[PDB]
Amino acid sequence: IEELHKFGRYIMGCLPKFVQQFSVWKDELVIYVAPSALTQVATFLKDHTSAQFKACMDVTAADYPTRTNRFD
Amino acid sequence: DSDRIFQNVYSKYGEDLKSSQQRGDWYKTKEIILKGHEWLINELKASGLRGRGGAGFPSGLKYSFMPPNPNREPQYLVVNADEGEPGTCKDREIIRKEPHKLVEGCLLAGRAMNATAAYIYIRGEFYNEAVALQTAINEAYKAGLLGKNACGSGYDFDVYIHRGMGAYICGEETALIESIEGKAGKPRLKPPFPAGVGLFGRPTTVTNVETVAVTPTIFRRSGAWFASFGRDRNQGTKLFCISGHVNEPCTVEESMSIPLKELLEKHCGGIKGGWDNLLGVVPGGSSVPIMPKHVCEDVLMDFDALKDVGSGLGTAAVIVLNKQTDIIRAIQRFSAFYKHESCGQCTPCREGTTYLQRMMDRFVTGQAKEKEIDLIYELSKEIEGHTICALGDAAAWPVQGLIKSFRPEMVERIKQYEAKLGESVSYGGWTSKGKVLDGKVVSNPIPHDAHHH
Amino acid sequence: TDLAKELVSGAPKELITERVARIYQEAKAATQSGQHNTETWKIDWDILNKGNRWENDLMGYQSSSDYMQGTILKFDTREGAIRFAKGQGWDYYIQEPKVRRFVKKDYSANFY
Amino acid sequence: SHMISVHRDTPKDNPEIPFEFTKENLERAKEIIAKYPPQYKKGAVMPLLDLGQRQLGFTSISVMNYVAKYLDMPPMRVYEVATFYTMYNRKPMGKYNVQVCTTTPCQLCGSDGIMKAITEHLQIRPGQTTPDNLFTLQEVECLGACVNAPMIAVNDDFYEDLTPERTVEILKGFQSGDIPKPG
Amino acid sequence: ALRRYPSGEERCIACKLCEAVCPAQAITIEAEERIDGSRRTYKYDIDMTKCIYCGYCQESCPVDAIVETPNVEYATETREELLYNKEKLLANGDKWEQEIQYALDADAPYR
Amino acid sequence: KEVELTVDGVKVSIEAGSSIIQAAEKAGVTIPRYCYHEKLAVAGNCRMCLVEIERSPKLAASCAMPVQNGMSVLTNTPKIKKAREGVTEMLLENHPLDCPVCDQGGECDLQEQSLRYGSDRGRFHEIVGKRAVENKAIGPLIKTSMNRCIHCTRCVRFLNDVAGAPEFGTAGRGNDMQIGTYVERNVNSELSANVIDLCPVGALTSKPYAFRARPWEL
Ligand SMILES: Cc1cc2nc3c(=O)[nH]c(=O)nc-3n(C[C@H](O)[C@H](O)[C@H](O)COP(=O)(O)O)c2cc1C
Ligand code: SF4
Ligand code: SF4
Ligand code: SF4
Ligand code: SF4
Ligand code: SF4
Ligand code: FES
Ligand code: FES
Ligand SMILES: [K+]
């Protein structure tokens, strides 16, 4: 939990223009970004040596009609 | 010690008023009454008088919770006169032998509490004393002391008697009020308190017959003399209905801090077998846990000294036993008593008191398991603190009393039954072959210990 | 929001012309004293005046031609439900929940 | 105390059996209400119930119906009172009532033996009625005679400090009418 | 198969548990108070072409009224014959009662 | 008039003289209850709503204890959760194993609160057995199975006060207390059947609706 919290903050500090917020649950770190911040944050997480996420496993969505932008 | 408060306890002074007055009855009364309810209550808070019901609350302070009655509106002062607890006989002796002493104290106490009327609730098992106490009531009415013109003063006092028809639960402070009003008699939740809101909507105060019967002395005799006996703040003289497995069960009137050994030699005979044969002691009453032998070595009768060792001086019904008896059956009988007497409205005591009863009956025969001994202890903790009236607390303390001090005896009982029966019994008493055939439990020892009847 | 978003949802035209939806908050049930199912707003569709349910002749089932009979939506704000209904161009009608009136309850009141 | 709380009409008991106070019991009943304030006269069910019990012999359903009528109460608030208290007999109960305390302070003086001694003579068990209707044995909880533990209670009397050889005096006498002196 | 007690009374008390577990919604139960007061079912269907043969109904039955017999050889010519109504399932419980006991005796403790 | 209090850190503003449970229910804290209904007089006998107040050793029946000013009320101490499981372990001591055959099956408060606030295991294997009661017949509309009553007196309080039908009450004492009418007579009120909704358990169920459906179907 701590190490993802540190590494989650590191990404936010590196890219304050894009990372709206980050969250940690057990052993899963989530980065929340706008649609216009997607290609930037994805590229950073792919190329930065400290975080080389070359492999994308899943692309999905979820419907929450109550929110203004339903799809997540 | 001289100057016993109740000397007619052996019936050698007379119950009629004429012999009552020469005994030390009404005198300086109007001067006491016309000293104000402020002087009487200020005496009592200084007195050190505390309730004889078992709570240990200051009797004098209790009276100061009542509101003043400028128009003398019908505020009642219920004079509790039930025994209830097994082994207690103090209340019977005061009513049956010294009736006018109680009636004197009620008026004096009622004067302090701005009251008008006083009800003396007496059990239905004291049927003859109910008629007898009413006979002593007639002698009180004729003297003109109780009525709309009390002793000629502008303050009045009225007395009525409300007989009960048999319920241990009615001995509560709130159950007592309900039974007068014609309800079943189940205790109420404390707010609003009877000091504020009680009988018929008017403020009321419940006091034991023993507590009221002592006020005539304390009011008339000095007032500072009271603090002399016992320890500090556990002050006053006290009746004791010593009984059980003893040489001579009898009643005394000793002070507080009386050591048990001195109390088991000076009077009340002694152990049936000697002090080395003592098994257990149930002071106060069946409510408190039964102390072991070693606790009694420096036991001093106090509202709190007995509390330090886990017991208490509730109704001073000090019980002394011997080692030629099975305490498991003796405690089991208390459990089957609180069950049969619990009013049955709160969930913890309506059901949990049956949970205890269904288990002590398996304990007394030893048909259980060794870990189940501490199972029932966890049950007794699930009852205390969850009930409205203190009967639930009084039904769990005896169960802890057996476990706290006599644990190896229950284990030996179970180990006997393993050898006696030959096959170890599982949880709940079920043998290996016990089952249900055509509507009945078969091939298992069924404990018909629910009084059969 | 303001857009006619239904033109991209591919839903049949009849949900716009021929069916009526309802935005409501589920009421508290008399049998149970829980108060949790009455905190989310829901959308349900009215039944059909014929063909909502009819008995299957062979096995006695409950046949139906209503494809919205088992569709209930959930929300957490009332506005989100209304906004979503507006977005799809639904002919809805809102059912305002009743509000229980406060009454203080005192133990002592049984005698006073 | 026999704990059944649902009343079944018998040939001996039903609301169709009339019950009316005697001329004397009216005078006591009129003055029993004198202890309770006018707006709370319903508190006198417990006195009147036992007062009416003695006129008839037990606490019949007609008594409860009559008592409720007297004090302007629905008959249920009397049924709640009647079955809560253990001294109301909702059955013929016979002539006498043996009450044998079996609690622990009494059981320390061999209170079992008194129970065996009574069961021997009358051929009955606790909670039973004799074939003659003269007696009806009945166990009981504490009565206060614990310091004088091994105590029997017949009707409303006291016989403390007893033995199985002390039971011979009383159980023989009551049939003959020679009632020993209580105390 | 729907089972019976040795006395002959149907085991199912129309409790509708199996209908609520059933992942495929293959069960249809309609119940009411019987003529003599018993809580019994008058309609009970399993859509054997909709069941996934999963055993949840069997696990959820509090009285072991609904079980799955070891039979597998019951292929039918028409699909109407695979809509087992209460008459059909009770006739299976009688037919396969002995074999159900074989399995219940063996695997009773493991459940 | 209003007295400001905090329940588990949530500020509460209610009318003075209200009980704790209404204050807690306004703050959103859920306090389990059986005997408390918001249209009936307060009885405090089911002992399930117990909370802890800061200046006391004694647990408070939040359905009866009136609200104070500045009082701190706790509801989630381990001491309280021990009490809730103790009380739950007592109601189910004598309750029958009737849930499959009980018309209250999917909508019974004794199920959902026991699931949520009680323990997941029972510690009652006693060989004497549970308490059994005879079902009382009180008309053609109310089907009684008194084995299941948890002695909560909602039926008594409703019929006496709201309905004005004083023939329903508690007859007996302690372990033999038996809600009913003592003698056999039908309940006579045009509002008598609302007791079917108040009775939280299957003790009082609809007779016309008996055995016909489960609440999740409707
Ligand atoms: C279950 C139960 C039974 C009680 N029985 C009696 C009794 O028989 N006599 C008595 O004086 N107090 C009895 N009490 C105590 C009363 O509640 C009351 O508070 C007590 O009499 C206080 O009076 P006091 O302070 O003047 O002594 C009983 C309490 C409980 C819970
Ligand atoms: S604790 Fe027991 S006896 Fe006391 S009021 Fe509650 S249910 Fe009645
Ligand atoms: S085995 Fe078949 S009928 Fe039973 S629950 Fe599973 S899918 Fe439903
Ligand atoms: S689970 Fe068993 S008892 Fe319940 S409805 Fe299904 S078959 Fe009947
Ligand atoms: S009342 Fe509730 S807990 Fe009791 S048998 Fe019915 S469903 Fe089960
Ligand atoms: S019958 Fe139902 S409503 Fe009445 S006390 Fe029992 S559980 Fe409560
Ligand atoms: S214990 Fe028997 S009279 Fe008190
Ligand atoms: S809800 Fe408070 S004790 Fe029942
Ligand atoms: K119900």
Distance separating alpha carbons of residues F196 and F198, to the nearest angstrom: 6
Find the angle CA(C32)-CA(C35)-CA(C38) to the nearest 5 degrees: 110
Which among F31, F46, F109, F110 is the best mutation to test ligand 8's pocket, defined by most ligand atoms within 8 Å of the CB?
A: F46
**E-assigned strands of B262-348?**
319-320
Measured by CA distance, the residue closest to atom 8 of ligand 2 is B343
CA B48 from centre of chain? 20
Tokens linked to D127: 């909670």
**What whole-number distance in Å separates Cα of residue B58 and Cα of residue B60?**
5
Please indicate if the annotation marks D146 as binding a ligand: yes
3-class DSSP state of B306:
helix
∠ Cα A32 A36 A42 (to 5°): 60
Its sign, for the CA torsion D137, D141, D144, D145, is positive
CA distance B410 to E56: 46
Q: Please, is D183 exposed, middle or buried when counting C-beta atoms within 10 Å of its C-beta (0-12, 13-18, 19+)?
A: exposed
What does DSSP assign to residue D164? Answer: T
| Whether residue E18 has its Cβ less than 6 Å from ligand 4 | yes
Q: How far is CA B10 from CA A2, B13, B83, D84, in A?
A: 82, 9, 19, 36
- Cβ of F182 within 8 Å of Cβ of D83? The answer is yes
Structure resolution, Å: 3.3
DSSP letters, E25-92, are --EEEEEEE-TTS-EEEEEEEEETTT-----HHHHH-TT--B---S------SSGGGGEE-HHHHHHH
- Measured CA to CA, the distance from residue F47 to residue F63 in angstroms comes to 9
Residues of C engaging B, defined by a Cβ cutoff of 8 Å: 107-108, 111-112
Q: How far is D87 from chain B (nearest CA, A)?
A: 5
| Closest CA–CA distance from residue B232 to any residue of chain D (Å) | 30
Quote the CA–CA distance of C20 and C22 in Å, as a whole number: 7
- Position D95: which residue type? K
Atom of ligand 7 nearest to the CA of B83: 4
Alpha helices by DSSP H, listed for B143-236, are 173-181, 209-220
**CB-based contact B279:B294 (threshold 8 Å):** no
Question: What residues contact F135, with CB distance under 8 A and at least 6 apart?
Answer: F144, F145, F146, F147
Residue B17: in which H helix or E strand, if any? helix B17-24
Distance, first Cα to last Cα, chain C: 57
Which amino acid is it at B124? G
Size of the B and F interface in Cβ pairs below 8 Å: 113
Measured between beta carbons, which residues in chain F are less than 8 angstroms from residue C107? 19, 42, 44, 64-66
Q: What is the largest CA-CA distance in chain D?
A: 54
Strand partners, E43: E30
Report how many Cβ contacts below 8 Å link chain C to chain E: 10
Residue B315 to residue B288: CA distance in whole angstroms: 10
Using omega within 30 degrees of 0 as the cis cutoff, is the peptide bond preceding B194 cis? Answer: no
* 8 Å CB contact between B60 and B38: no
Q: Please, which residues have CB within 8 angstroms of residue B37's CB and are 6 or more apart in sequence?
A: B68, B111, B112, B113, B114
SS3 A19: strand
Residue with tokens 């004598």: F94
Concatenating the DSSP letter of every residue in B375-388 gives HHHHHHHTTTTSSS
Test F212 with E39 for CB contact under 8 angstroms.
no
Q: Would you call E99 helix, strand, or coil by DSSP?
A: helix
Alpha-carbon span B222 to B220, nearest angstrom: 6
Tokens of B156: 């009045």
Q: C107 and B197 in contact by Cβ < 8 A? A: no
Tokens for E37?
A: 């007061």
Report phi then psi at F26, rounded to 5.
Answer: -75, -35
Minimum-distance CB partner of B441 among F82, F123, F127: F127
Q: Is D103 in the pocket of ligand 7 (CB under 6 A)?
A: yes
Find residue B441's DSSP bridge partners: B436
Is the Cβ–Cβ distance between D154 and D97 less than 8 Å?
A: yes
Written as one letter, the residue type at F51 is V
Taking an 8 Å cut-off on Cβ atoms, the answer to whether E28 and C59 are in contact is: yes
Q: Judge whether D158 and D138 are in contact, CB under 8 Å.
A: no
B83 lines ligand 1 (CB under 6 A): yes
Give the gap in angstroms from C-alpha F99 to the nearest C-alpha of chain E: 9
Ligand nearest to the CA of B90: 1
Q: Would the CB atoms of E83 and C58 count as touching at under 8 Å?
A: yes
Sign of the torsion formed by the C-alpha atoms of F95, F99, F104 and F109: positive
The answer to whether the CB of E48 falls within 8 A of the CB of E83 is: yes
CA distance B413 to B399: 16
User: Rounded CA gap, B121 and B107, in Å?
Assistant: 16
Q: Are strands E27-33 and E39-47 parallel, antiparallel or unpaired?
A: antiparallel
Q: What's the Cα-to-Cα distance from F182 to each of B172, D50, D83, F135, F201, rounded to whole Å?
A: 26, 19, 9, 12, 21
**Structure tokens that stand for E92 in this block:** 């299976």
Relative to the CA of F144, which ligand 6 atom is closest?
1
Tokens of A25: 């649950």
Residues with CB under 6 A from ligand 5: F 95-96, 98-99, 102, 104-105, 108, 110-111, 148, 201-202
The length of chain E, given as a count of residues: 111
> How far, in Å, is the centroid of ligand 4 from the Cα of E12?
5
Give the residue from chain C lying closest to A65, CA to CA: C84
HEC-encoded secondary structure of D91-128: CCCCCCCEEEECCHHHHCCCHHHHHHHHHHHHCCCCCC
What is the Cα–Cα distance from B362 to F161, expressed in whole angstroms? 44
DSSP bridge partners of C92: C21
Asked if B253 contacts B239 with a C-beta cutoff of 8 angstroms, the reply is yes
B102: Cβ contacts below 8 Å, ≥ 6 apart: B79, B81, B94, B95, B120, B209, B212, B213
Type of residue numbered B223: G
Partners of residue F82 in chain B, C-beta under 8 Å: 382
* DSSP character at residue C102: P
Neighbours of B453 (CB within 10 A): 13
Which residues in chain E have Cβ-Cβ distances shorter than 8 Å to C56?
none
Q: Which residues in chain F have Cβ-Cβ distances shorter than 8 Å to D79?
A: 169, 171, 182-183
- Measuring CA to CA, how many Å separate D45 from each of B129, B136, B173, B402, D80? 21, 25, 20, 42, 11
Q: What is the rounded end-to-end Cα distance, in angstroms, of chain F?
A: 45
Q: Could you tell me which chain F residue has the CA closest to the CA of E63?
A: F100
CA distance B25 to B221: 12
**What letter does residue F162 receive in the DSSP assignment?**
I
| Nearest-CA distance C75 → chain A (Å) | 5
Ranges of beta strands (E only) in B257-411 are 319-320
Within a 10 A sphere around the Cβ of B156, how many other Cβ atoms? Answer: 16
Q: How far is the CA of F62 from the centre of ligand 8 (A)?
A: 7
Residues 360-379 of B with CB under 8 A from D: none
Q: Note every long-range contact of E48-54, with CB atoms under 8 Å and residues 24 or more positions apart, other chains counting.
A: E48/E82, E48/E83, E48/E84, E49/E79, E49/E82, E49/E83, E50/E24, E50/E25, E50/E26, E51/E22, E51/E24, E51/E26, E52/E23, E52/E24, E52/E26, E54/E23, E54/E24
Nearest-neighbour CA in chain F from D177: distance (Å): 36
Task: Determine which helix (DSSP H) or strand (DSSP E) holds B29, and give its type and residue range.
Answer: helix B29-33
For the CA of B83, the closest atom of ligand 1 is 8
DSSP letters for F60-94 = EETTTSBP-SS-EEES--HHHHHHHHHHHHHHTTS
For chain F, give the residues followed by a break (C–N over 2.5 Å).
none
First to last CA, chain A: 24
> ∠ at Cα A53 (A48, A56), nearest 5°?
145
- Strand C92-95 and strand C21-25: pairing? parallel
Distance CA F5, CA F68 (A): 7
DSSP 8-class letter at B187: P
CA distances, B13 to each of B19, B24, B105, C49 (Å): 7, 11, 19, 98
Cα B400 to Cα B90, B329, F55: the distances in Å are 26, 14, 27
Please report residues of C whose CB lies closer than 8 A to that of A67. Answer: 80
DSSP code at position B87:
T
Q: What angle do CA D20, D21, D25 make, to 5 degrees?
A: 175
Query: In sequence order, what are the residues at sequence separation of 6 or more whose Cβ sits closer than 8 angstroms to the Cβ of residue A71?
Result: A61, A62, A63
Give the chains touching D; criterion: ≥3 Cβ pairs < 8 Å.
B, F
| Solved using | cryo-EM
Mark B33-48 as b/e (b = at least 16 C-beta within 10 Å). bebebeebbbbbeebb
CB B134, CB B39: distance < 8 Å: no
